[PDB]
């Protein structure tokens, strides 16, 4: 639904950086690896925790109610 | 008790034998099975003892 | 096979022949109704040696 608050494995906070990741992907047109590394995720656990998210909250949100 | 044509009594005897038969056994060879009001076969005592689901 | 002759092969193939069932359906190419009217002369021009050797 929403980006997870913390990395499941290490517990690093990754909910801070979802919109920064989207901005680096769209505005700056950086590849996935560069965007993640510049956001400061070194461990592949955190890196997949941001890379594999699906922004299902948008789909659920923009119904009527 | 009333008039006894000897052919309608034969028909009624056949019906009552058929009914006792389907009541006690619903797997007759070469005879239609008794159907219940809902159209499924009626559950006979043989059936209630018959298979794995049966009583034994 | 027999005890004193088990190591042999001549008896083994002999008894294979003696027990193996043989039917004509295996060996006949064609068993056929022909017309040969006469005994002395055969209609098939090549068959003759059969009756020459009889004679």
């Amino acid at each position: 639904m929403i980006v997870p608050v913390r990395c499941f494995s290490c517990g690093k906070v990754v909910g801070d950086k979802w919109e920064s990741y989207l901005n680096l992907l769209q505005e700056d047109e950086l590849d996935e690896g560069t965007a993640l590394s510049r956001l400061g995720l070194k461990r592949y656990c955190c890196r997949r925790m941001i890379l594999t998210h699906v922004d299902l909250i948008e789909k659920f949100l923009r119904y009527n109610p | 008790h009333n008039g006894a044509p000897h052919h309608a009594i034969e028909e009624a005897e056949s019906l009552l034998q058929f009914h006792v038969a389907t009541y006690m056994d619903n797997d007759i060879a070469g005879q239609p099975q008794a159907l219940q009001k809902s159209g499924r076969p009626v559950k006979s005592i043989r059936a209630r003892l018959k298979g794995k689901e049966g009583r034994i | 096979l027999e005890p004193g002759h088990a190591a042999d092969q001549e008896q083994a193939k002999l008894i294979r022949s003696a027990i193996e069932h043989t039917t004509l359906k295996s060996v006949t190419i064609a068993s056929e109704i022909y017309y040969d009217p006469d005994p002395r002369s055969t209609v098939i021009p090549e068959d003759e040696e059969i009756i020459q050797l009889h004679f």
Binding site: - | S38, G39, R40, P41 | -
Partner: protein, 237 residues
């Protein structure tokens, strides 16, 4: 397209391998015994015999089919006329019929509208039916002589799949026929509007609700498991 009529027709080469009496016969709808094929051709119209053997074995040089057909034409000589052949299908029909009336007509109907309905339902021509029976016999003979593939029942070219279209077509066909019967009975009762629409509605609703794909609830041979609850556990499912 319609009438949902599966006129199963069997054609059997009675006998066994190495047996002399190798007799080919065939079945008809509502006939109790396998009519010999030569009698079927007689009924269809091929009174002559060489025409029958030509309709069966196309390659005259290939004597083997005629050789295996010899018992058939030997034992089918008991009829040599079209009327007699229809009448023989009549004797096996046994519908309390007379030599001319209600019996030759039954045989004509059986051999016209019920023998291979897919070829042609029309009255005009029945040589198609004879040629197709000849082809079918040729295929049976070739399999008997081991010259052709015995059809595998599991081959998808020979299989078909009834999707929602054909299945609902079958159900609506039976439900509509029931509706026609109901309105016809109502019109008869009007000796001197009023259509049960719930007949089509509720029956179709049941057949989808329970999966029992049957013309009526009363039939236990409905072949259940046609409609199932959609399993929305996950998208892949």
């Amino acid at each position: 397209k319609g009438s949902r009529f599966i006129s199963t027709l069997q054609v059997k080469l009675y006998g066994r391998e190495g047996s002399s009496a190798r007799t080919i016969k065939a079945t008809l709808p509502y006939i109790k015994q396998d009519i010999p094929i030569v009698i079927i051709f007689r009924a269809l119209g091929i009174i002559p015999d060489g025409e029958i053997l030509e309709h069966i074995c196309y390659d005259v040089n290939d004597w083997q089919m005629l050789e295996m057909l010899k018992p058939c034409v030997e034992d089918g000589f008991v009829i040599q006329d079209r009327e007699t052949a229809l009448d023989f299908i009549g004797r096996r029909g046994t519908a309390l019929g007379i030599k001319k009336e209600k019996r030759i007509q039954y045989a004509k109907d059986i051999l016209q509208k019920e023998f291979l309905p897919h070829i042609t339902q029309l009255e005009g021509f029945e040589s198609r039916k004879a040629f197709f029976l000849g082809y079918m016999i040729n295929r049976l003979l070739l399999c008997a002589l081991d010259r052709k593939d015995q059809d595998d029942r599991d081959h998808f070219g020979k299989k078909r799949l009834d999707l929602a279209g054909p299945l609902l077509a079958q159900l609506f066909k039976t439900l509509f026929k029931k509706l026609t019967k109901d309105i016809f009975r109502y019109m008869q009762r009007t000796v001197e509007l009023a259509i049960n629409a719930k007949t089509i509605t509720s029956g179709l609703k049941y057949a989808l609700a329970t999966g029992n794909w049957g013309e009526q609830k009363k039939a236990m041979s409905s072949r259940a498991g046609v409609s199932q609850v959609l399993n929305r556990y996950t998208y892949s499912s």
